[PDB]
Amino acid sequence: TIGIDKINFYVPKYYVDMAKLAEARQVDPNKFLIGIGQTEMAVSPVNQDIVSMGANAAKDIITDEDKKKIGMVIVATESAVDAAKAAAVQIHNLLGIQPFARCFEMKEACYAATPAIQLAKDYLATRPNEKVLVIATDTARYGLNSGGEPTQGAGAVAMVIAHNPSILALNEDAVAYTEDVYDFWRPTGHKYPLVDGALSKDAYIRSFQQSWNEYAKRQGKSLADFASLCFHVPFTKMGKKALESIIDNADETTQERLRSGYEDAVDYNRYVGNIYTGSLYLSLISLLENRDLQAGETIGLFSYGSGSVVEFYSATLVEGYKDHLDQAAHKALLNNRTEVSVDAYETFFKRFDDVEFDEEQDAVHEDRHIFYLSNIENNVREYHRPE
Amino acid sequence: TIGIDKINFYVPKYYVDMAKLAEARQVDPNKFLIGIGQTEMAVSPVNQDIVSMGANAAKDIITDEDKKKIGMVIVATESAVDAAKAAAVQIHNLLGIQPFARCFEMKEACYAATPAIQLAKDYLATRPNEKVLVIATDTARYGLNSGGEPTQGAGAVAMVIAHNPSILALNEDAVAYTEDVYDFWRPTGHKYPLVDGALSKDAYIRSFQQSWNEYAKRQGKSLADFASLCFHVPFTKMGKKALESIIDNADETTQERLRSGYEDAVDYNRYVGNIYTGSLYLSLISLLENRDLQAGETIGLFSYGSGSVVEFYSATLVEGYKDHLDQAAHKALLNNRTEVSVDAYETFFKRFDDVEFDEEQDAVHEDRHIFYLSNIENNVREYHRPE
Structure with a gap:
């Protein structure tokens, strides 16, 4: 490994x-x-x-x-x-x-x-x-x-x-998904990002959905198979809306578990804010420390970058x-x-x-x-x- | 391969x-x-x-x-x-x-x-x-x-x-070498690079020398083994000074070959100028097209980045x-x-x-x-x- x-x-x-x-x-x-x-x-x-x-x-x-x-x-x-x-x-x-x-x-x-x-x-x-x-x-x-x-x-x-x-x-299961979109970007000379509020939510959730869909297809796996997810969030509410969209056709047991996992995953982020490339990985620490996941259970991870690139992959606890x-x-x-x-x-x-x-x-x-x-x-x- | x-x-x-x-x-x-x-x-x-x-x-x-x-x-x-x-x-x-x-x-x-x-x-x-x-x-x-x-x-x-x-x-022979030096850099808000003229030449040649030295050690290979080199150059004269420094303890046959190779390698660059990340790879095209290297011969390549990182590796013609x-x-x-x-x-x-x-x-x-x-x-x- x-x-x-x-x-x-x-x-x-x-x-x-x-x-x-x-x-x-x-x-x-x-x-x-x-x-x-x-x-x-x-x-x-x-x-x-x-x-x-x-x-x-x-x-x-x-x-x-x-x-x-x-x-x-x-x-x-x-x-x-x-x-x-x-x-x-x-x-x-x-x-x-x-x-x-x-x-x-x-x-x-x-x-x-x-x-x-x-x-x-x-x-x-x-x-x-x-x-x-x-x-x-x-x-x-x-x-x-x-x-x-x-x-x-x-x-x-x-x-x-x-x-x-x-x-x-x-x-051995990572799959990425690129779409050229202008949700968030920061041209040279710009101190702060440019943000299209009409696109922020949709671009982020669509990338998650398309990355997950293809992952599920390639792997023959489903949301039910994951002990928890852990994904990029720009703020906890937006991540909650993404979660509910992704899990909206899943069974109650899966839904409840993944909701519970999300609350553990976003705990540290709640007291820090968005740290861009590190947000997913801060959530991972938060998840690993707040939840009592067992050796051999698998986490489903989704990484997002504005502009935009998404990637779904899994990792198994040791x-x-x-x-x-x-x-x-x-x-x-x-x-x-x-x-x-x-x-x-x-x-x-x-x-x-x-x-x-x-x-x-x-x-x-x-x-x-x-x-x-x-x-x-x-x-x-x-x-x-x-x- | x-x-x-x-x-x-x-x-x-x-x-x-x-x-x-x-x-x-x-x-x-x-x-x-x-x-x-x-x-x-x-x-x-x-x-x-x-x-x-x-x-x-x-x-x-x-x-x-x-x-x-x-x-x-x-x-x-x-x-x-x-x-x-x-x-x-x-x-x-x-x-x-x-x-x-x-x-x-x-x-x-x-x-x-x-x-x-x-x-x-x-x-x-x-x-x-x-x-x-x-x-x-x-x-x-x-x-x-x-x-x-x-x-x-x-x-x-x-x-x-x-x-x-x-x-x-x-x-399977790449080795990199990093040293934190201020030869050339470009902080946020700077249109053009900052350049320390007292360091440009030395930082570039030292990176080549240290990367090459370690490569030679790891591989048990010498300059004599390469049909030609192909390396990053900021302008053809500076690349010539780097070449002469690297080959200065080599035998006449090696020296003459590598000098000949260099002239083929830097031909296109002479009519373009420095293209930073692409300079080495433009030289590679120039080398491959101007010289009549044979299948099975090996090129020794050196990549440089200001600041600084160098890497020596080889590639064999197919x-x-x-x-x-x-x-x-x-x-x-x-x-x-x-x-x-x-x-x-x-x-x-x-x-x-x-x-x-x-x-x-x-x-x-x-x-x-x-x-x-x-x-x-x-x-x-x-x-x-x-x-």
Whole structure:
């Protein structure tokens, strides 16, 4: 078997409360809390960029020995800080990985961590002693007072792909589906995404439906066969509408199980927001930690990228997997964050746009044990490393 | 075997003469013609973007039957037009490829077409009836009166990766080498690359040397074993300096052969300029068409990406390969271009920056049989398709 051997996430140390954001935007708090289904939104300090976030998600899941065996570092992002230099190169340096490795980004909106792990697996077939590090890292930023605002988030998810994986074996059943649609895109020079509200829902659900339909056909499998699904969601309510559409012709037992699974899967996302390439994989952690799925049960996963590309594939739980998760650390990561007022959130937002350093607002003296963006000099980003 | 089954390139229909550019920049023409070693620079009309260029390079090498079998379309570029939507999605649509395919970009400066074909090959190992389309597409644009100006170029190279390849079998010997260096990069919001002239030469040659050294060690092979090399070059003189550094301890027979090979390899590049991810692969076409290498001989290839990542690998020529090249069409492609004055070049340059349409300057009535960018409306690029 080849698959996910280790998995971790990082989110920044601040969040804004969604009920307070609603109050400031002069709408009912329930519009955000229930209508959109988001409770806390991640808030990015300037000292957390996609590079430091990725490094932080990965640093806890690789040993010194792993660093000798990692043959590729692949970063999935649609929030790149460079048009040429892959963030994977910077992270590879920060992490002290052995030098004979490919480092590059994959890009296709929120889909790109999927080809990264799937091709990482194909790469490993003939290389028994190697591993691959895949990092999804992104900042979903729509703009103050924009339609997309309440869905914003930031974070990174790191996965180690290896032989004899300790968590999930990836099965030989991935199928992708591409349709050229303009639901969401971000041309050069655009700070924030362009969004066609008339297409958002339909494009996302249609990709799920078409990917699933073809999967089911190729595999002779049905929704009933999966212990749970785990799929990309831009916000929990939209994911709920996708789920209900997909399962709408299924039996009651299946429907109830998959609904239960979904609530476990989207729990962490509820307190973070959309992290684009990492959203699916954050949900996967949430699912694996909140639900008590058994060894040998199979999860059905759906990955989406705006524009659009979808992929359905499955992964089977490996005996002992619970021993390789860190529910306690993940709960602490989320719980140890600091709530920031709406006015502070807006200031942080404007500063991020401009990469305006402020060691006091970002409270960098608290960050001695993590990677962070410490400065830019001569157009080169500089990083503080854990002491 | 798995490898390059078909390969083609596209460059825009205009060029500026390098001797005239030198005259306008008030330097000796020989400074460009010999010092840099470039003769004609590709000139981009607004109606050729990375999408239409990629589509044009690919359209001639895929049949209707191929369109049913292509399971991934991968675009390598550091000249993306979108921060989220992969150009691969647009090209997949233009080309009418079957919908159950992954479409995404890979990004790591001028290196990215290499992981694309190499991972395309790993992807194919268990999928006997599939093919992969890889497209390198880029515009190397440094700015009017900039240091990098004389090295500019634009074009795309398409490759079909398949089982039983008709041209080159990729061997099981790729090794990459990553070092975090600031030779060349392009942060968000920067129109043109940042270049550290003190590092350009050294970073490029060191990556070649370190990648080659490790390859030689892993494989127990030497420069003497290769019929020719084929490597990324930013301009022919810099590639010549890299070659001489790499071969400087080799025997006379090897040295003479590899020097001869290099002149064949860089011939097309001399009349185009740097096309970033496609430069190596344009040289490969030039090499395969200009030199009379025999079936069973092996080429040693080196791919470079600024920032930096290098990769050395080999590929072996397949019997009958000459039957799958189109020297005549490629010579016509280059020869049928129109020379444009330095003043016209500058106007084209400024228009490209602004995507300023002009059907008269771009002479679009001549372009009935190619893809081209015809307009942008509501932030969506629109394309004319061959009639």
